[PDB]
Amino acid sequence: HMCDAFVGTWKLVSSENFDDYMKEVGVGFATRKVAGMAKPNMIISVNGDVITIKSESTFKNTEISFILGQEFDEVTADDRKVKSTITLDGGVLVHVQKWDGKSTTIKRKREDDKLVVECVMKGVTSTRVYERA
Numbered sequence: 001h002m003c004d005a006f007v008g009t010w011k012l013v014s015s016e017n018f019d020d021y022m023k024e025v026g027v028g029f030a031t032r033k034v035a036g037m038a039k040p041n042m043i044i045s046v047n048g049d050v051i052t053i054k055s056e057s058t059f060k061n062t063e064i065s066f067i068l069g070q071e072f073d074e075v076t077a078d079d080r081k082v083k084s085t086i087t088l089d090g091g092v093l094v095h096v097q098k099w100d101g102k103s104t105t106i107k108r109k110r111e112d113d114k115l116v117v118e119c120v121m122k123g124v125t126s127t128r129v130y131e132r133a
């Protein structure tokens, strides 16, 4: 019952600073535009120790599966090849991506009836709020 409050199908309801976050990450113009237009559903499931997170939109359908604390290689929606580790820290799922000497952290937390995603790259934070579908 690790992560139960995260499990489910979630729909994006608001975004702030995502274009600026993607700029800082290095996402190019055309991908930023089409990805910033995405209205993703985030689908989170658990089977034993394996957590799966899917992001589905008209831009891309992506899926990762992982065990907490155990690094994996990921291809991101914007085609970076990154090394990822996801942990649960005080109720927050913390996802760190490392590539080309850079790092970004994506945090997922439950707040009221929302799932709030905070994406940080150097000084820039984007907040992406989801509700149950």
Ligand SMILES: [C][C][C][C][C][C]SC1=NC([O])=N([C]C2=[C]N=[C][C]=[C]2)C([S])=N1
Residues within 6 Å of the ligand: 022, 025, 027, 035, 038, 040, 055, 057, 059, 060, 076, 077, 078, 106, 117, 119, 128
């Ligand atoms: C750069 C990226 C792009 C994307 C595109 C599509 S939409 C979406 N997806 C996803 O997954 N998410 C989570 C994350 C991850 N990573 C990073 C950040 C975040 C969100 S909130 N949204």
